[PDB]
Amino acid sequence: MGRARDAILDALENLTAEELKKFKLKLLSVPLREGYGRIPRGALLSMDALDLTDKLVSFYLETYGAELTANVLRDMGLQEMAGQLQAATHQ
Template identity: 35%
Template structure:
């Protein structure tokens, strides 16, 4: 069976139990991530379950830095056994990328900057999301309700004839979004087309 990094993260987070998982969420919000990343807002973590937290980690930090953050947070809450198991399980994940030395060092020190060249998931897969996303209107409705699109921008995108044209126009407006906004965009995309997002996360490897 083919497992992804997300699958492995969820499985190991579930082993924490309710009390330690709450500690993990709190520490994840406090963890001093390296630039250009930003900490996941506390409000998004408070009621998140294991699946939600895995999604937030990968959307905010991608693979492999999300793995580094997860491992360091586990160690900071004295869950070394699960951290070791997570490292072992990740070796079986189809899309696992080992963290660079810069990521490892910055993760341990917490305050150092690393030249990551990191791209958010929605930027890294821009071309695929434009060409392969089917129904775009429900996505626009959610973006409007989250105030990531103005009424004017919403109307402009809706007026385009094809899904590809709508997504292309939407990406034009997304250039001003910060990391948190892109996290929300990722969650909305996953809500409306989870099979596509999972396929992109697998990166075609199995």
């Protein structure tokens, strides 16, 4: 399958346990493109990094999942991680 399920993991494994919670919280209110669902709170507020990567690639696709992860990471301040994620996904 696509390798985008790995580039996301390498991006979410570099987050500390404190800013992973911030990522999950901001995932609850980020604007979404039409036709895509939103992860429910009950599952979102308890997943670890691996489950979160699986769920992100499941609800969204490779391209949109990577793009959404990059946008959320950039909006919360982390610039180098979003940059390396975009570098890994685009080429």
